[PDB]
Design a binder for this molecule. Structure first.
Ligand SMILES: [Mg+2]
Ligand SMILES: [Mg+2]
Ligand SMILES: [Mg+2]
Ligand SMILES: [Mg+2]
Ligand SMILES: [Mg+2]
Ligand SMILES: [Mg+2]
Ligand SMILES: [Mg+2]
Ligand SMILES: [Mg+2]
Ligand SMILES: [Mg+2]
Ligand SMILES: [Mg+2]
Ligand SMILES: [Mg+2]
Ligand SMILES: [Mg+2]
Ligand SMILES: [Mg+2]
Ligand SMILES: [Mg+2]
Ligand SMILES: [Mg+2]
Ligand SMILES: [Mg+2]
Ligand SMILES: [Mg+2]
Ligand SMILES: [Mg+2]
Ligand SMILES: [Mg+2]
Ligand SMILES: [Mg+2]
Ligand SMILES: [Mg+2]
Ligand SMILES: [Mg+2]
Ligand SMILES: [Mg+2]
Ligand SMILES: [Mg+2]
Ligand SMILES: [Mg+2]
Ligand SMILES: [Mg+2]
Ligand SMILES: [Mg+2]
Ligand SMILES: [Mg+2]
Ligand SMILES: [Mg+2]
Ligand SMILES: [Mg+2]
Ligand SMILES: [Mg+2]
Ligand SMILES: [Mg+2]
Ligand SMILES: [Mg+2]
Ligand SMILES: [Mg+2]
Ligand SMILES: [Mg+2]
Ligand SMILES: [Mg+2]
Ligand SMILES: [Mg+2]
Ligand SMILES: [Mg+2]
Ligand SMILES: [Mg+2]
Ligand SMILES: [Mg+2]
Ligand SMILES: [Mg+2]
Ligand SMILES: [Mg+2]
Ligand SMILES: [Mg+2]
Ligand SMILES: [Mg+2]
Ligand SMILES: [Mg+2]
Ligand SMILES: [Mg+2]
Ligand SMILES: [Mg+2]
Ligand SMILES: [Mg+2]
Ligand SMILES: [Mg+2]
Ligand SMILES: [Mg+2]
Ligand SMILES: [Mg+2]
Ligand SMILES: [Mg+2]
Lengths: 213, 121, 258
RNA sequence: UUGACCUCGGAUCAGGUAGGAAUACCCGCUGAACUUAAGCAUAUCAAUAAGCGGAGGAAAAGAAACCAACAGGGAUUGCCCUAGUAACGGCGAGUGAAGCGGCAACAGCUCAAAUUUGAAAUCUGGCUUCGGCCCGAGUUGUAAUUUGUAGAGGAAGCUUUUGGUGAGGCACCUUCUGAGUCCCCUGGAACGGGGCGCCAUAGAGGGUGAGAGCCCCGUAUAGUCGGAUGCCGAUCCAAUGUAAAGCUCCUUCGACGAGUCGAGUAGUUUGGGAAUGCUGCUCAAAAUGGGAGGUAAAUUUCUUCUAAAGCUAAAUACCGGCCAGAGACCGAUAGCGCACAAGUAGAGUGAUCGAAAGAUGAAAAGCACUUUGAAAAGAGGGUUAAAUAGCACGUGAAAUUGUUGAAAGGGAAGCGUUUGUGACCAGACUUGCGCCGUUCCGAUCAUCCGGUGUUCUCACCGGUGCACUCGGGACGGCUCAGGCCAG
RNA sequence: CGGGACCGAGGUUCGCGCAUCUGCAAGGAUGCUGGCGUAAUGGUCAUCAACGACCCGUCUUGAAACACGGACCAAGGAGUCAAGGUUUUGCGCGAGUGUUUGGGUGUAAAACCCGCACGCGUAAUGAAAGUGAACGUAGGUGAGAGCUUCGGCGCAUCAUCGA
RNA sequence: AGACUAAUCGAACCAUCUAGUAGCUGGUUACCGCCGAAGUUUCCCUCAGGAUAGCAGUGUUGUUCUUCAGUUUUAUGAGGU
RNA sequence: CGUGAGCCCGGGUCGAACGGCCUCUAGUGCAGAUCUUGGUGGUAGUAGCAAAUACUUCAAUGAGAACUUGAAGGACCGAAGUGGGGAAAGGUUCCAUGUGAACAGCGGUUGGACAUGGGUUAGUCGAUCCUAAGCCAUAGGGAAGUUCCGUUUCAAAGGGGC
RNA sequence: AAACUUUCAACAACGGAUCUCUUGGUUCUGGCAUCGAUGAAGAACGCAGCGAAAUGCGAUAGGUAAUGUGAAUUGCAGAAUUCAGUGAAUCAUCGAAUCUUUGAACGCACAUUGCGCUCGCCAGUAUUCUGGCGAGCAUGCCUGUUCGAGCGUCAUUU
């Protein structure tokens, strides 16, 4: 029933949609109840922070790898380097992720210093105040000026590396010899023809040359 | 205003609770002020009317008569006062209903349950 | 309306050949509802035309920036004496329109007796008394649902939530028409009620200090420029610059008949 | 002959459990057509309605045989976006996800596969309950260790463990906490109008004989009269190491789920296209093996996980059940079918179908008594503010009808333009402004404060006043204007 | 130069003219007189009279139709809402724009504040691999509102030859 | 006999899918002001309907020494009634 | 008053709320749809109240008597009846006393109507017992399942004495 | 001229519109998670001083016990000793009970208030018959108990 210079419609409304219409009139009511739940959790968890410490991870695609975010938990390699037992970290507010693996020393080193920074500022009360143990924070070190949420203080600080660097003209980097455009064109051609060159190396004539001494 | 999410300010619900109140609830609703002499003696503003209290009518066409209460008739939310009556066609006298808020209690029937009530307030 | 309304029946049309309209009719034979029409907006117990849904756009998304532009305009309009009078406030005894009361006077206004006395002293008594004496009973079915009365709007007290404190609002509730607002909120529904500019505002001294900080904390919003710099057309037209280039009036206000 | 074991039975044997209801939301199976394609058969409607089975306060899913191809993310769920996109489709009509990213929430674990083998260390049941004992289960494997993040065996070092006592601060209900019935008028009755007051952390709401903050219940802040239970910690005081837990180390090992994986074929399903999932049948594996890496196949590499066993709260859905609070909603032909003895009366053999129906008055004060009548009732009389509210009851429209009054009528009436006649009636008009003639009060001007557009004016005060000023009424004269119809 | 009819709009002077020491018939009616001052004029209704007047809605080339619906009255009764587009109007910001998925806060479903990502736009063209917008005052010619130091400059937009 | 199967039979009755679809019939609710048509072209399983162009309204804009014309004259062609 | 939709005022009834102006909002305007629901007309005091042969006199009751009652006369059903009983079905219609309205398509003092009471007695009648056509369990076998088949089968099936 | 027909007004009718209201509906939001073989949901029949329905309840029947409140219920007499009451009420709370016949419905049936069987007590001369009262008797499945079956099978006697 098209009548004029219209855009061809794409309205997927032919499947008795009126039975499955979800209207969010409780958006304000849900928000208030979520805050009530958060307040109750904080009161029960006091003086512990309401959340857990998480590592910095790099986003997993070429579109987002320029930026870092918070991960699920610290890998076992990071925990072992920091000097924290795997089954002790969950009891002191550290998130553990046995699935994650470290393929670079840089990311491992960045997360280890974060673990050591948190460990420095962490106060652990004794399991029974009468007799403190070796690993319990002494009574004098406890002060009472604590923090509410870890992720506020231990969030990402520079998710994307800055691009406002300024250098002296003496330190000006040199140019690519053949031209940066030609460098990209040559790189593309090498990947496109990697199999053709290897096939002919290794050529039937080259094999014939190998065969014919 | 009203700030209590457990209390309604609905006209429809307010009237339903008033006209469907059980006998015990209707007792509290049917209360009258005390006189100045009783107010200063007991430090109480108002209490529910008992059967044998003596009141004085303040409002209506009987607004100066007084006498002993003879019936606290909770179903119609009215009080029957002695000698405050009205004549039928046949000439027989029937009592007229007086709302408790239209009278003032000039004399209480003191009993150890009422005496306890006065101490609580 | 309920989605089942008008459709809780099994009526079917009788068709032609029976000297009745072709509309669906109830079945059975033992009730008044024997052969009565059932479905349709014209029937007695049918359904309404296009039954109302809860999908309707109840809420409106207004751009943040037009809200702030209007709130600034409402505050600016609150600083003009003609706009206060044209609204209907009794400001005949107010010294200056931006009525700013020293915040030290609000020390003991947590009691309604003191708060009312303070408004009378500063010159807001006439507006306060007007609101109290205007309580009427509204006309219509509004009384049935919840809305029983209408009682006019009085002065709006604006304070600072961190310096003045939160005890000010306690003494200003039972006063009819008088309402409070922290300097960092400034609801537009209270600054131009009904869409009419010129609310009578009673500021505290502390709230005036913070008004500049409030509008400099708002990120992404600068105080707007105006399409006209000098908003007074009398001086613009009667200026020596303008009148010197006019090539004399070619006629008069009232023309002689031909 | 007797005693075992295996398998199969009896018993109103001892002790237990299941069914049905409910099903709004949830987990499955089964499963249409109307409709769209302007016909119609694939398609679509729709992996929907109907049907069947099974739970809970949520359910389900869930700790990768994942996503990716990156500098790599890291259980599940939900929202926003991806995206009306990749893709599917008589490539027509149409349908149509997922990775990444931001956020809400956050939590991890238990088995099989090992000889406790110097000691079945395990468990139901009965008795005793006083410690234990006695049958039985079980070696065709119950306890302890181990679950791939590992682990086991080493030998050095470091390190870990239990009971108590409760403030109160929540969560439960429960008693208590402000101010006029002051004067006058209208009214049947003030809750109305006018005046004089008071409370307010309380001017939400309702009732009371009409619009009540102060007549009554409640409403706003805490804090007190109490008591039921179980959750949490802040101070303090008790102890102790059997043989149990970790951490660093490298050598040695390092069991890891089969009619399953996978392949073919058929059906169905999917965006999944040489086949996304599921199911039936046939074939049917392996140990650095296997799966996946979105185009079928052979060859060679690479990346990521470890299927065929299991449990687990939150964010999420839902107004069906229970309880609350609200509305720019409806207002008795509306809103649910039901504001009422409504799933009722009633209809149908039955499955089922299914209404209509609110309002006297503030208070029954619901009409005593007399008289006519067989009686229903009528007429007097009385109640009420009102019967022009009499239970056939708030107000009481129209259609339709009766009486009275006013008109007209030779096979319609109604209607438009225009008069006449008759009945009824609204306006306008009644005088007003000026000048000159009587009787009573303060004007010109100046001083002295105070305001102001800087020269105007208000406050007190000298204005002193009968044909002289100013103002006002009394009675006369003249001019002007003034309604309707006309020459 | 006579006889008659209908009309009097406008509301201080200004003007066009004519006459002459006056003024006027010249940019629209004044003067005098009379009756009544109320149902007398006027209005409504009823009625008679003159002239005229087919029953509405609808489909249709054509309806008063021997085309259909309509006995009468009251109440109810039919272009609504959502998502997605497009053009136009108003508004804010403007190479940016959009707070409200969510978080903080609150007089508590309101109002106020916050920020990362993301959507649209800023770059297109190919089936794709991919490539990716200045010879020049971002060009020349003609027209062009407006401005002009009067010799010229020339926005938007259109036509044309180019890059 | 397409007969009978609860006054129902060339496929009973009940509830639901379901407000099934309908290029076809009927209806579609105040006033005034201004402008004001078409039944024609092309395509269609098209002929009681659509899309398309035409006719119309509204909103504008470039402008407002804006330009042209259902017309005549002069000059000069075509036609085959 | 307005060209008009409409607005305003006076008079009568009535008894508790309502209006103007500026914006916002919509379940917002009726003459029709063989429209829906309710109510009311002309027709119209009209069609009609005509099958089953049929009634009359006196008296009582009563406000009132063609259709109440008693007596007398005249008739009909004419034993495959307009009689005396029952099965199914109905459910108090049975009986007495009393009666305003409504019902008995005319009346009504009468009634299967209305109101208040009363009324159904079993070892011997019937049900109960038996089996018929047939239906349903059990053992089993199908089916995703609601359930279908099976009634003696491919079952360790029961009944009595001291 | 009247009658009749038509029009209007007043009054009176018929009818229930309009106005105003509202212990009702509807939608949204917030909180909670609790049926049943220890017999559920539903059904039938009964129970009040005077009740047909509604509501409530079950032969302990418009209800009992217990707790709290504190003087009623109401259409009439009936409670006035219940007035210090050691306690009214169609009150509120509710932790103890009662709970007819049924119904998943469970001895077998049921269109029957039908037909049975076991134990105990009481009465009739009664271990057997009759009557009254009480407690019982479904199916599937699980663990155990005890009684068995099978040349399935082991050892010994024999
Ligand atoms: Mg007919
Ligand atoms: Mg089709
Ligand atoms: Mg079609
Ligand atoms: Mg078809
Ligand atoms: Mg279903
Ligand atoms: Mg679960
Ligand atoms: Mg997009
Ligand atoms: Mg699909
Ligand atoms: Mg296939
Ligand atoms: Mg299928
Ligand atoms: Mg397939
Ligand atoms: Mg699970
Ligand atoms: Mg009256
Ligand atoms: Mg009345
Ligand atoms: Mg009436
Ligand atoms: Mg009438
Ligand atoms: Mg004739
Ligand atoms: Mg006339
Ligand atoms: Mg002439
Ligand atoms: Mg006249
Ligand atoms: Mg006249
Ligand atoms: Mg005429
Ligand atoms: Mg004619
Ligand atoms: Mg019409
Ligand atoms: Mg024709
Ligand atoms: Mg004809
Ligand atoms: Mg027709
Ligand atoms: Mg007709
Ligand atoms: Mg945002
Ligand atoms: Mg952006
Ligand atoms: Mg150009
Ligand atoms: Mg035939
Ligand atoms: Mg038949
Ligand atoms: Mg239909
Ligand atoms: Mg074709
Ligand atoms: Mg046609
Ligand atoms: Mg067109
Ligand atoms: Mg030719
Ligand atoms: Mg009233
Ligand atoms: Mg409508
Ligand atoms: Mg209407
Ligand atoms: Mg109508
Ligand atoms: Mg009709
Ligand atoms: Mg006749
Ligand atoms: Mg006949
Ligand atoms: Mg015979
Ligand atoms: Mg017989
Ligand atoms: Mg009889
Ligand atoms: Mg009769
Ligand atoms: Mg009669
Ligand atoms: Mg069977
Ligand atoms: Mg006429």
């Amino acid at each position: 029933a098209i009548k004029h210079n219209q855009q061809i419609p794409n309205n997927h409304f032919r499947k008795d949609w009126q039975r499955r219409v979800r209207c969010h009139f409780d958006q304000a009511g849900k928000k208030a109840s979520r805050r009530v739940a958060r307040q109750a959790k904080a009161a029960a968890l006091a003086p512990r922070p309401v959340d857990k410490l998480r590592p910095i991870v790099r986003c997993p695609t070429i579109k987002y790898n320029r930026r870092t975010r918070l991960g699920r938990g610290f890998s076992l390699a990071e925990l072992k380097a920091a000097g924290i037992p795997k089954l002790v970290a969950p009891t002191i507010g550290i998130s553990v992720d046995p699935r994650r693996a470290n393929l670079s020393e840089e990311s491992l080193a960045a997360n280890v210093e974060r673990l050591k920074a948190y460990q420095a500022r962490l106060v652990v009360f004794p399991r029974k105040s009468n007799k403190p143990k070796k690993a319990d924070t002494p009574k004098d070190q406890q002060t009472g000026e604590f923090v509410k949420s870890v992720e506020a203080v231990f969030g990402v600080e520079r998710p994307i590396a800055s691009g406002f660097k300024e250098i002296p003209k003496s330190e000006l980097p040199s140019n690519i010899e053949g031209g940066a455009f030609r460098a990209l064109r040559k790189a593309r051609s090498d990947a496109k023809l990697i199999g053709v060159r290897e096939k002919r190396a290794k050529d039937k004539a080259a094999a014939e040359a190998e065969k014919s001494k | 205003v009203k700030v209590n999410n457990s209390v309604s300010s609905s006209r429809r619900k307010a009237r339903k609770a008033h006209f469907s109140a059980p006998s015990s609830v209707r007792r509290n609703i049917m209360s009258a002020p005390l006189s100045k002499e009783l107010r200063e003696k007991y430090n109480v503003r108002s209490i529910p009317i008992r059967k044998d209290d003596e009141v004085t009518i303040v409002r209506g066409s009987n607004k100066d008569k007084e006498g002993k209460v003879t019936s606290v008739y909770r179903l119609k939310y009215v009080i029957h006062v002695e000698r405050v009556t009205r004549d039928k066609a046949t000439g027989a006298s029937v009592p007229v209903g007086i709302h408790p808020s239209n009278v003032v209690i000039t004399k209480l029937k003191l009993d150890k349950d009422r005496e306890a009530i006065l101490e609580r307030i | 309306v309920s989605e089942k309304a008008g459709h809780q029946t099994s009526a079917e049309s009788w068709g032609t050949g029976r000297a009745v309209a072709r509309i669906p009719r109830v079945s059975g034979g033992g009730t008044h509802r024997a052969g009565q029409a059932a479905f349709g907006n014209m029937c007695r117990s049918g359904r309404m035309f296009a039954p109302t849904k809860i999908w309707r756009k109840w809420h409106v998304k207004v751009n943040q920036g037009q809200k702030r532009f209007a709130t600034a305009s409402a505050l600016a309009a609150s600083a003009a004496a003609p706009l206060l009078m044209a609204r209907g406030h009794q400001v005949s005894t107010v010294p200056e329109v931006p009525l700013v009361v020293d915040s030290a006077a609000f020390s003991g206004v947590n009691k309604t007796a003191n708060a009312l006395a303070l408004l009378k002293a500063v010159g807001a008594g006439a507006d306060v008394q007007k609101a109290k004496a205007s309580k009427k009973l509204r006309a219509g079915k509004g009384k049935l649902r919840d809305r029983r009365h209408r009682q006019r709007r009085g002065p709006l007290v604006v304070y600072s939530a961190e310096t003045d404190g939160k005890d000010l609002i306690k003494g200003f509730r039972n006063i009819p028409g008088v309402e409070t607002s922290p300097v960092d909120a400034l609801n537009l529904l209270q600054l131009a009620p009904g869409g009419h500019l010129g609310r009578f505002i009673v500021w505290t001294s502390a709230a005036i200090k913070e008004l500049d900080a409030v509008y400099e904390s708002k990120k992404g919003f600068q105080l707007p420029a105006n399409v006209v710099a000098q908003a007074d057309l009398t001086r613009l037209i009667n200026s020596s610059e303008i009148q010197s280039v006019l090539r004399t009036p070619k006629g008069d206000a009232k023309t002689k008949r031909s």
